[PDB]
Each structure stands twice: as structure tokens, then as C-alpha cells.
Amino acid sequence: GSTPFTLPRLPISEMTNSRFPLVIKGMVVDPNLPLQANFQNGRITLDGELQGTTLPTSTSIGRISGTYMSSTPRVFNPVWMDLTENNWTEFQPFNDQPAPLGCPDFKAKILGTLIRQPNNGSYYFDAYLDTRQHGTFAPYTGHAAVHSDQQAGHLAQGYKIQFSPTGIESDQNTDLNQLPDYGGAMTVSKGLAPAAAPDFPGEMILYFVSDMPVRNPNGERRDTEILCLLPQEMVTHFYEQQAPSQGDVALVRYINAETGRVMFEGKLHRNGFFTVSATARTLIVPDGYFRFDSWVNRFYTLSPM
Amino acid sequence: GSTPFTLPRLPISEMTNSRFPLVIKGMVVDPNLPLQANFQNGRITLDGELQGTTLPTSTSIGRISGTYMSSTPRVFNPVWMDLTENNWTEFQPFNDQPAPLGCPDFKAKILGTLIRQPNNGSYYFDAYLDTRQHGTFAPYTGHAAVHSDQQAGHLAQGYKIQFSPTGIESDQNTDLNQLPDYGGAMTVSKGLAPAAAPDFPGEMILYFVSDMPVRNPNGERRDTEILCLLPQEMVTHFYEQQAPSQGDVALVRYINAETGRVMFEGKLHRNGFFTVSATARTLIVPDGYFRFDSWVNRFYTLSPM
Ligand SMILES: [Cl-]
Ligand SMILES: [Cl-]
């Protein structure tokens, strides 16, 4: 009677990143990527329990929303936001959720626009959200500021506004595998999705990869990838099906879309991430799909990739 | 043995528009909206056959892509593109597809950015795509131009570039329910998704609604909605399941998410759109989900909304 667990029958090439609105360009396993992952977006259990700051669908990944504050709690001045969820429902600060759902889970100067909502006249202008700064990016406290030199005259106390990202600036310190300090100078622990980590020596996380759009001054080049543990279409699939997990870990096979050949197998863990048996950096082109084959015991040994 | 037809068990409030990257804010039936719909995005049959320019997932809705042409086939100069699909595979012009998949299917000055791809150094800058212009927007011919005053020095012949939209300018003539002229001055008919139209007097199309972001000079106000026939998550669901249709038309019920009460019923047509029995403008808040109940004969009479 219980809903069987399944994966979406879609090639990875047709999926999108769960941490930024981008297509998946492939997968990577690498001993020089972080051995454990702590992302807060793209986190769901296999039986459909959202974790961290993860949205169920791609409504507003990377966005923050709220109402304009005329006072704090080229020259770029802060635009302060009394934060809401991106669907404009209330966000309770200092509670059991690190930030509103969909809030960026990386540290960067994020470029984008600030959108005045239709009730106050649809308009938008350029702004950035610098998630490296404790003073203006502490969303766990219920407030955050974007920065803009284009806001003059367009906002008044209480206006609904939403930040929509286009990309980042990237420098020598950019590392998108580090979480921001959601509480600013104040530590936060409650409601974080836990570390995803293999428990088999010889297994590594299989990450899904996208290219992050970058706009540095004068076009300075520092190309940057962004990883996630689950493409958003897998998050939505597990959320929608709510299939009970019926074993320690899910055995999955990656199937070539053209030939139907089994390319490799992996473990899909209940906490929502993939591991494979590998020792060296391996790049997987996304012209295949994952197929759930069976629930297996935690001591199952994967065929080496 | 055949896959049963189903709808995604998600409230409409968690779905996104199939014609622009936006959340669905509700549904509308209205005798003063077009009685037939001709959108090319968000078109799929119930058994999973994509139509028009419709992508299976939200990879690149509203984008166009290609390689830079240094020659034609503030002051804003055209940036000419030898068009590809947005996944960088080849687009065959003058054939059986009106434009690359995901190409905008409305006429507007679409604001956004132009993205130089990582192989030539990740960088992006502001640009617009004016889909009202025959001379620079004829994607059926394999070429189109965006316009920019920020490109100087950043592009060379053959560079991969992608236009990503943020919103539109809107004026007194804006009407997003009219298709662009995909062939420019040359008519195009081949490969268009057909008109969606009720076949019951007393029934009207149930449209899904989003608010389009607008940026007019000086913040001039002209708020604009954009309609679609299917949210993209329904498109993806039907595409993924490939469920055979087992009757003339699908009977669906809209269920209140809180109470589980049946709010109204409608017909979900094989060509991929909803109709309901109504006479006057009716606005539906999206805090419910559609449930497939049975295949019915084409002469089935719906309970009035
Ligand atoms: Cl499966
Ligand atoms: Cl259903």
C-alpha cells in the first residue's frame, strides 16, 4: 500500500541546480572537493522531508524578500529589509530555521535586482546582496540589507521588495562550499541541515555541477562552479511522492540515455545525497539518468566506478 | 500495465509559470481574456508530447542562446546571435520548429543580461531583447539580435552567449497574449502549437497567472500579468510520466489544501489546458491542488464553478 520509492525519469542534463537558478552541466566526484557537504538548499530526505532552507520547488531559489525599513534595525547605500518568506508569509527569527527558505547558502557579493511588488507599482533596479558581511547579512535575526545606488525615491516604509540574483562577483577568496554566518556575529545551530558525509571509506560524494554566472569589474576572469547534492527536480520528486524509505540506503544505477547501458552505481542516502566508490577525480557528463533499483543494507559494497 | 495518468500532488502556490521564470499567484477565468490561447511555451499533451517551443523543465525559459556574429546576417547597438538551442545543441532554421525551445512567446522589450560563457571567461552585462521588431527578432531564420551599450570589447566572433531575462518594459500597447512574428516579415506556420480552445459553450479557459516584473523609465507604472495554460511543474510531470490518455478528456477537481474540500471541477484537455464552466470573471487563489478523478466522454457537463 505504501508509495514505492522512485527517481524522476529525466536525464540529469534537463535538471537544474538546487542552490542557484542554473542548469546542471554534469556531476563530479573528487578527493579535492570537500569530503562532507553542509549546504542548506537542495536538502530533503528520500521520504520527502525538507531540511535546512530548502524550497520544495524552484520558486525563489537564491532570493530574499521582505518589507522596506526606512531605518537600520559609486556609493552604495544599504536597503534594509524586514524579512519574510519569499512567498510573503511570516518568517520567525531566532527560532528553528536558519533563514527564510531559498536564502543563499554561500558567501559572495551576489549581483541582482531589487523588485518593488505590484501593489506599490511594479519597478525594479540593480542591487547586490553581500552574504559575506555580518552587519548587513544576518537573516536568522529577521533583517538583512541589499546595497544599491539606484533606490533614491522608489521605496517607502513597508513596501514589499524582493532581491533576485543574476550572478556573483568572484575573487581569490571565493569558496561557495562555505555556509554564511546566518546569525551574523551570533552563532546559529538550530534548524541547519546536517553534514552530508559518506560512511564507507573508499566512497565519496557525487556532486551535481553548474557554472555560476560571474560579473567582475572590467570582465576580470575567475570562472566558478557551484555544487549541489540534489538537483531541484529530484527534491520536488521526493517531496511530491512522500515515499517511505524501506531499507538502510537506496541502490541506484546511472543509465546512459542513448544506449541504456548501466554506467555505474551509487548509494542514494536517506538524508538526500549520492555517494559512489571512487579514488580519483571523475567527471560525469549529464546524458544519463538515475534509476532506483533496490533498498540495500548499510554494509553494501558498491561496484567501483 | 500502462502508467496511470496523474497530476503532481503540489499546491498551485508552489508552481511556476511556463512562459517566464515566475511563481504562480493564482488562476483566472474571464470572458474578457482571450477565448482561445496560442502560447508556444507551456504546451504539452497529457501523454507527454512537447509542443511549440516548450522545454520539458525550467532550464532556460525566456532565454535565447547562440554564438556571436561580428557582422549582421544612450546608443544601443545590436549584438547578433547565430542561434542554438539553449543547451547549445544545433537549431535548424526554416524547419518544423518556430524558434529554439524556451524562446519568448510574447512581444515586448525584454530586459536582461547577456552572458559570455565560461570557455571565453565568465562575464555578463546588461542587454535587452525586443521581440516586437521584425528586423532583429526573426528566430525561425536562425538569427536574432539583442541590444546593448555595454558590449564594447567583450565579444569576438563565435563566442557562446546567452540572453537571460529579468523583466519587461510595458506600455499602452503591451499585450502578452499575442505571439511574436517568429519569421520576422516572413510568415511562419510550421511547428506552432495549435490554438487551445474550449469546445463547450459555457466553458472558458482557466489560465494560470503570474505578475511580470516591469522596469519602465523613471518607474512609470503599468503593472502586467502573464498567463499560461500549464505551470511548468505540470509540464514536467506529464513529460516524465508519459501516461497514455484513456478517454476523451480528463475530469479534474480542485481541492482546498487546508480543508480537503472540493472547490470546483474542470476539464483537463488532451492538448494540455484546463477549462471550467463559468460565465463571469472568477479569480482562484492558489492554495489548492488539482486531482485527476477520471477519464470522461467529450459531452460531459461540468458542475458550474
Ligand atoms: Cl526510479
Ligand atoms: Cl492526480
Residue numbers in the entry:
A (entry chain A), B (entry chain A): 223 to 295, 311 to 542
Provide passages from the article that reported this PDB entry.
Noroviruses are highly contagious, infecting both humans and animals. The human norovirus capsid protruding (P) domain binds histo-blood group antigen (HBGA) co-factors for infection, and a recently discovered bat norovirus (GX) was also found to interact with HBGAs. In this study, we determined the P domain structures of four human noroviruses and one bat norovirus using X-ray crystallography to examine structural features linked to potential interspecies transmission. The principal structural difference was a variable length P2 subdomain loop (Loop A), which was located near the HBGA pocket.
The P domains of GII.9 (AY038599), GII.23 (KT290889), GII.27 (MG495077), GVIII (AJ844470), and GX (MF373609) were expressed in E.coli. Also, these residue side chains were properly positioned to bind the fucose moiety of HBGAs (structure not shown). These two equivalent residues were lacking in the GVIII and GX P domains; however, an aspartic acid (D367) was located nearby in the GX P domain. The cross-reactivity of the P domains was determined using direct ELISA with a broad-spectrum human norovirus Nanobody (Fc-NB26) that binds to a highly conserved region on the P domain. Fc-NB26 bound to the GVIII P domain at weaker concentrations than these GII genotypes, while Fc-NB26 did not bind to the GX P domain at any concentration tested. The GVIII P domain also had many Fc-NB26-binding residues, while most Fc-NB26-binding residues were absent in GX.
